[PDB]
Design a protein around this ligand. Structure first.
Ligand code: CHL
Ligand code: CLA
Ligand code: CLA
Ligand code: CLA
Ligand code: CLA
Ligand code: CLA
Ligand code: CLA
Ligand SMILES: CCCCCCCCCCCCCCCC(=O)OC[C@H](COP(=O)(O)OC[C@@H](O)CO)OC(=O)CCCCCCCCCCCCCCC
Ligand SMILES: CC1=C[C@H](O)CC(C)(C)[C@H]1/C=C/C(C)=C/C=C/C(C)=C/C=C/C=C(C)/C=C/C=C(C)/C=C/C1=C(C)C[C@H](O)CC1(C)C
Ligand SMILES: CC1=C[C@H](O)CC(C)(C)[C@H]1/C=C/C(C)=C/C=C/C(C)=C/C=C/C=C(C)/C=C/C=C(C)/C=C/C1=C(C)C[C@H](O)CC1(C)C
Ligand SMILES: CC1=C[C@H](O)CC(C)(C)[C@H]1/C=C/C(C)=C/C=C/C(C)=C/C=C/C=C(C)/C=C/C=C(C)/C=C/C1=C(C)C[C@H](O)CC1(C)C
Ligand SMILES: NCC(=O)NCC(=O)O
Lengths: 41, 192, 207, 165, 219
């Protein structure tokens, strides 16, 4: 699975998974914390 | 030397031939020779002014002229100071100006001499000439009386910061009731 | 080994026989450092002697409270001892206590940092000095014979009295009354009156 | 009132905008039965809109001539009037997070530059090394300031290519 | 190198040898890879730990004394406002400026000691007091006028033991002050009040019931 994990470590797979997890994290942030116009603490 | 501050201790090497030396320097402030040379003159000067201040406060209280704290209180409120009932028509500005001029002249013409001459001079400051003929024990007496006088003056300051009364009035109140009239009884020294 | 059979002495309690009550009891090994062990031995002597004095005071004053000898001074509980007027108020008593205990304890610490350096007073009189925490304050002289056994008796009584004062404070914060009254109330049954039947010690029982 | 702006808690046009949005959503409501899935979706949308408007009125935003929140992008003007969360606090947040990402990428570049084949390591990313450097990049400001004070963050101009003028 | 570490199984980083007090090999972010930056961070750790120890003492000892009916000291979070309402209270800005001026004078000297460890000890600096700033060769451990009782200056390893005790106490008090800040931010009660509430019902009274730690939006 060394070659398979090397394929998973290739630049397109890693950038698509990274933008996927970042977009999903931001989406769930807006799902639980919607309409956050300002950083009101 | 006469004394060792603690009964049993290691003694600093630079505090032996000094008058009124007990080896009391746990901080090691006078490890350098120049530091000791300056601090000796500082201690002598502090002791002399503390003796002068203690004499002033005792003589202003036992002679019944007023309190040492209340000496500059009438200096404003209109004016007119008090000294043996004299009118003395000097206001606050001229008094401070004359004192500053006199002190500047005296201290400038003072500390421009030799290190021994800055602290231990002769001439008109010993007119009776009894510095000659064993001066070490007399210097020891001067330093010890100066230390006692500094303790007395800082005690006057702390006592008036605490209870707020006169020195001799506080002494009389302590002699009258030594139980409830101590440093411990007021709520500023002992919080527990 | 002495404190626990089928156990081994923790190395640094083996070679030093010259310790009072050296029974090998150091399972947490507080004094492996020799200077730490010297400090802890001095703390032993100080805590044990002050605890012997304190527990003797508690027991004697409570005996006088339960039987009745002294007046209103001795007819108060030990924890309520401050209710009496005495001769001086609280503040000055605490203050002079601070001053004179500062004097004595600084003499003791000056002995600690250099043994034998502080045995001479300004009056010129001198006393003999031995060991470290044993400054030879023996006027009627019971130290000339078998000093190890006398030291062992002292350290055993000191440990017993430190345990005693821990018991005194624990009983007082657990059950009301004088410690002699607590001993009698224990002796009443004694199958029911003990530390389990308090409601303040086991917590598993009686919530 | 920092620049002729009124707070949205008391500005009338903010309440008018909220009322108009809720009324439009109610007009959308008045076509389905009460317990249908579109009805629940519209009720959730209404609740979100009212919560958003009440939160904007609560947080102390400034409204202009009409009921639209305005942000202040001046330190001091936003600090002493309590609107540092408009621009200043998100400025700090972005600076921190962008520095984290950039420092992680930089350290990956300098870590794989001193390997056997730096060419291969940039299309075939060493995932454990990237994860470790992404974690280490959370202390990017202190590391960057330390490397700047050390002089190891910047490169000497005599070792950098330029054109022949 | 065989000293106990922050993870029995994870070897220490190569920039944490064991010489510094409290070196348990804990640096997962590798912030102290630069030696000079490591020295600066060591001094910052000493200063933060000492200030946190002083602050946590001044929080938990007066609060405990108030709990047992001694002195009656208000809450540490509102103690600034309690004094600021006094009839002879110094204004906030003026008091802050006085404190900052004194601290500027002191800690610029401390800073120059951080750079060169024998900085302030040169003759002619003060008025005879420059002899007390020799230092012990390690910045953050001045000695001289500081440490009057001379604790640890006897066997060298005695001072290293005290150094480790100091750094562990400082780290514990820093964590404690972070706890005080986070506990008062969530629950409007003192640290001892939070402790007493936790002992009443640990499964009910904690950080999962304040409503501020875990957000209500998720649950
Ligand atoms: C050594 C410093 C010293 C200082 C700073 C003062 C300062 C003061 N004293 Mg003095 N005293 C001092 C020493 C002594 N006083 C007194 C005895 C008194 C009395 C009895 C009174 C004062 C008073 C005063 C005040 C009036 C101003 C003054 O003295 O004008 C400068 C002095 C002069 C112009 C005279 C100098 C005479 C000298 C050249 C011979 C003033 C704040 C008066 C006061 O305010 O009482 C409430 C007052 O009534 N002092 C004695 C004798 C024990 C002192 C030392 O031995
Ligand atoms: C650089 C321009 C820019 C800026 C400054 C913003 C800023 C903002 N947008 Mg916006 N947006 C933009 C471009 C921009 N957007 C573009 C180009 C589009 C079209 C795709 C959108 C579409 C859009 C929508 C649909 C919404 C926003 C929303 C928001 C707000 C939500 C803040 C937040 O997410 O909470 C805080 C986020 C965090 C604390 C996460 C930070 C840490 C993460 C995990 C790190 C990520 C690593 C990379 C915020 C003020 C939302 C809103 O409600 O507006 C008020 C929303 O609904 N934006
Ligand atoms: C070192 C231990 C110790 C200490 C510190 C005290 C201290 C005190 N005792 Mg006490 N006493 C002790 C041992 C001690 N006693 C022992 C062992 C006995 C048994 C013989 C007594 C029997 C005793 C009696 C009978 C009385 C005191 C009384 C007093 C108090 C005042 C004494 C006085 O002014 O004269 C005497 C005071 C008179 C009014 C008479 C005083 C606080 C007196 C007291 O309690 O005050 C009311 C009191 O009458 N003691
Ligand atoms: C129930 C609460 C309470 C507590 C905690 C104390 C505590 C103390 N009292 Mg006090 N007192 C109390 C109630 C209490 N008192 C009451 C109800 C009365 C009568 C109304 C009095 C009347 C009284 C008098 C008249 C005097 C005291 C004195 C003292 C101090 C003993 C001197 C000493 O420790 O040496 C000095 C201490 C040090 C050198 C180091 C500081 C202590 C550190 C923490 C180390 C000690 C270890 C510690 C005790 C062990 C851990 C706790 C342990 C119990 C588990 C001490 C701190 C005496 C005093 O003020 O000192 C002379 C004193 O004269 N008390
Ligand atoms: C990005 C550039 C920038 C710009 C254009 C401004 C502009 C302004 N600032 Mg500002 N400021 C800035 C950066 C900037 N600042 C930064 C980075 C900080 C953080 C250190 C501050 C901190 C700050 C404070 C604390 C204050 C201002 C204030 C002001 C306003 C009044 C200035 C003045 O009185 O006359 C010009 C001043 C000269 C010295 C010329 C003004 C509109 C004041 C304000 O809030 O207005 C009411 C105010 O007190 N600023
Ligand atoms: C992490 C890598 C990295 C870093 C540290 C930088 C840093 C910098 N870039 Mg650059 N850049 C990058 C990637 C990077 N860039 C890539 C991939 C591209 C192609 C799209 C560019 C294209 C680019 C241009 C055209 C310019 C810069 C400029 C600059 C400088 C201005 C600040 C800035 O943020 O500009 C903006 C940076 C961007 C718009 C690109 C950001 C793209 C992503 C977010 C970075 C890559 C993330 C990386 C994959 C993370 C790896 C993690 C690791 C653990 C594996 C600055 C020093 C400007 C300059 O020269 O200033 C003087 C400039 O003109 N960059
Ligand atoms: C660096 C740590 C630190 C800091 C920042 C503070 C800060 C504060 N303390 Mg605190 N304290 C500390 C440590 C600290 N303390 C420690 C270690 C203890 C012992 C455990 C205490 C015990 C303590 C008590 C008992 C009280 C305070 C109080 C206060 C507050 C007012 C103090 C004041 O009136 O002005 C400064 C005080 C001075 C004496 C100024 C010094 C100048 C004088 C005139 C020179 C001396 C002559 C203040 C917020 C008081 C409070 O809570 O306010 C209501 C109060 O009751 N503190
Ligand atoms: C810096 C000193 C500025 C304080 C001025 C205080 C003004 C009133 C106090 C006030 O306006 O309320 C507190 C204010 C922010 O609170 P908000 O007003 O946003 O709170 C209300 C909403 O958040 C909740 O609905 O905090 C600040 O002042 C700025 C934050 C410090 C910035 C941190 C950055 C550190 C670098
Ligand atoms: C040595 C050492 C070393 C080691 O190592 C460490 C240590 C410990 C730190 C040390 C110690 C120290 C000390 C103790 C110090 C102190 C000092 C003092 C006390 C001073 C005073 C000092 C004091 C002083 C001068 C005082 C003075 C006074 C005066 C002038 C007064 C005046 C007056 C009078 C007449 C009266 C009127 O009505 C008022 C007046 C006008 C006001
Ligand atoms: C060894 C070891 C080692 C290993 O390894 C580990 C371990 C296990 C940890 C260990 C153990 C330990 C322990 C057990 C400890 C304990 C101690 C104590 C108890 C002390 C006390 C101690 C105690 C003490 C001092 C006490 C003292 C007391 C006193 C003074 C009293 C006084 C009094 C009196 C008379 C009367 C009045 O009316 C009141 C009063 C005022 C109250
Ligand atoms: C090691 C490491 C390395 C790796 O690599 C990475 C990582 C993970 C990042 C790391 C970790 C870190 C950490 C943990 C940190 C933390 C810190 C802190 C907490 C500080 C504090 C610190 C703290 C501090 C100073 C504090 C201080 C305090 C004070 C003064 C207080 C005062 C006061 C008082 C008395 C009372 C009154 O009434 C009020 C006031 C006025 C308020
Ligand atoms: N050359 C004068 C001098 O050294 N003065 C020092 C002092 O003020 O005692």
């Amino acid at each position: 699975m060394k070659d398979f994990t090397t394929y998973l470590s290739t630049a397109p797979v890693l950038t698509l998974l990274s933008v996927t997890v970042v977009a999903g994290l931001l989406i769930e942030i807006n799902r639980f914390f919607p309409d956050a116009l300002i950083a009101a603490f | 030397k006469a004394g060792n501050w603690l009964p049993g201790s290691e003694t600093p090497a630079y505090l032996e031939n000094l008058p009124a030396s007990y080896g009391f320097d746990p901080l090691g402030l006078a490890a350098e020779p120049a530091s000791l040379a300056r601090f000796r003159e500082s201690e002598v000067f502090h002791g002399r002014w503390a003796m002068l201040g203690a004499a002033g406060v005792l003589g202003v209280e036992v002679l019944g002229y007023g309190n040492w704290y209340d000496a500059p209180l009438p200096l404003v409120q209109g004016g007119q100071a008090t000294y043996f009932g004299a009118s003395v028509p000097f206001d606050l500005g001229t008094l401070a100006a004359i004192e500053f001029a006199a002190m500047a002249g005296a201290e400038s013409f003072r500390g421009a001499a030799e290190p021994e001459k800055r602290v231990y001079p002769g001439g008109a400051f010993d007119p009776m000439g009894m510095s000659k003929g064993n001066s070490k024990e007399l210097k020891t007496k001067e330093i010890k009386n100066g230390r006692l006088a500094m303790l007395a003056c800082l005690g006057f300051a702390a006592q008036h910061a605490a209870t707020g009364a006169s020195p001799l009035e506080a002494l009389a109140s302590h002699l009258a009731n030594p139980m409830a009239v101590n440093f411990a009884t007021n709520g500023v020294s002992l919080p527990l | 080994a002495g404190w626990d059979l089928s156990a081994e002495v923790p190395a640094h309690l083996a070679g030093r026989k010259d310790l009072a009550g050296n029974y090998g009891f150091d399972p947490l090994n507080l004094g492996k450092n020799p200077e730490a062990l010297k400090w802890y031995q001095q703390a032993e002597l100080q805590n044990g002697r002050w605890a012997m004095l304190g527990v003797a005071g508690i027991l004697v004053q409570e005996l006088l409270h339960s039987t009745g000898l002294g007046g209103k001074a001795a007819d108060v509980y030990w924890f309520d001892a401050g209710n009496n007027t005495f001769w001086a108020p609280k503040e000055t008593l605490i203050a002079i206590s601070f001053l004179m205990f500062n004097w004595a304890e600084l003499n003791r610490m000056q002995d600690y940092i250099k043994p034998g350096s502080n045995v001479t007073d300004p009056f010129g009189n001198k006393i003999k000095y031995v060991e470290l925490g044993y400054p030879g304050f023996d006027p009627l002289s019971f130290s000339k014979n078998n000093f190890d056994e006398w030291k062992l008796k002292e350290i055993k009584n000191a440990r017993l009295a430190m345990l005693a004062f821990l018991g005194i404070v624990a009983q007082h914060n657990a059950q009301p009354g004088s410690p002699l009254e607590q001993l009698g109330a224990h002796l009443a049954n004694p199958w029911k009156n003990h530390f389990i039947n308090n409601g303040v010690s086991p917590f598993l029982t009686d919530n | 009132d920092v620049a002729g702006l009124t707070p949205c808690s008391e500005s009338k046009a903010f309440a008018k905008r909220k009322k108009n949005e809720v009324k439009a959503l109610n007009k959308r409501l008045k076509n389905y039965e009460a317990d249908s899935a579109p009805a629940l979706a519209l009720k959730a949308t209404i609740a979100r809109t009212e919560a958003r408007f009440d939160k904007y009125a609560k947080q102390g935003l400034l409204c202009g001539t009409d009921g639209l929140p305005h942000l202040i992008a001046d330190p001091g003007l936003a600090l002493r009037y309590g609107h540092a969360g408009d621009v200043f606090i998100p400025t700090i947040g972005f600076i921190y997070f962008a520095g984290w990402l950039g420092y992680a990428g930089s350290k990956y570049l300098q870590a794989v530059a001193a390997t056997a084949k730096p060419i291969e390591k940039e299309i075939i990313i060493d995932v454990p090394l990237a994860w470790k450097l992404l974690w280490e990049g959370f202390g990017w400001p202190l590391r960057a300031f330390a490397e700047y004070k050390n002089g190891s963050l910047m490169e000497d101009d005599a070792k950098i290519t330029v054109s022949p003028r | 190198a065989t000293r106990p570490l922050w993870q029995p199984g994870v070897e220490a980083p190569k920039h944490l040898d064991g010489t510094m007090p409290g070196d348990f090999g804990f640096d997962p972010l590798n912030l102290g890879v630069n030696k000079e930056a490591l020295n600066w961070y060591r001094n910052a750790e000493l200063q933060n730990g000492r200030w946190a120890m002083l602050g946590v003492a001044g929080i938990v000892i007066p609060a405990e004394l108030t709990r047992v009916g001694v002195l009656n000291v208000p809450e540490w979070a509102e103690a600034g406002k309690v004094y600021a309402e006094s009839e002879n209270a110094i204004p906030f800005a003026s008091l802050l400026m006085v404190q900052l001026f004194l601290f500027n004078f002191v800690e610029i000297k401390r800073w120059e000691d951080i750079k060169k460890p024998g900085s302030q000890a040169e003759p002619g600096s003060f008025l005879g007091f420059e002899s007390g700033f020799k230092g012990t060769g390690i910045s953050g451990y001045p000695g001289g006028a500081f440490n009057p009782f001379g604790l640890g200056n006897s066997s060298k390893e005695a001072m290293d033991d005290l150094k480790w005790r100091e750094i562990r106490n400082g780290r514990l008090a820093m964590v404690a002050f972070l706890g005080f800040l986070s506990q008062h931010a969530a629950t409007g009660k003192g640290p001892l009040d939070n402790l007493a509430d936790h002992l009443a019902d640990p499964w009910g009274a904690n950080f999962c019931s304040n409503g501020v730690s875990i957000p209500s939006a998720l649950g």
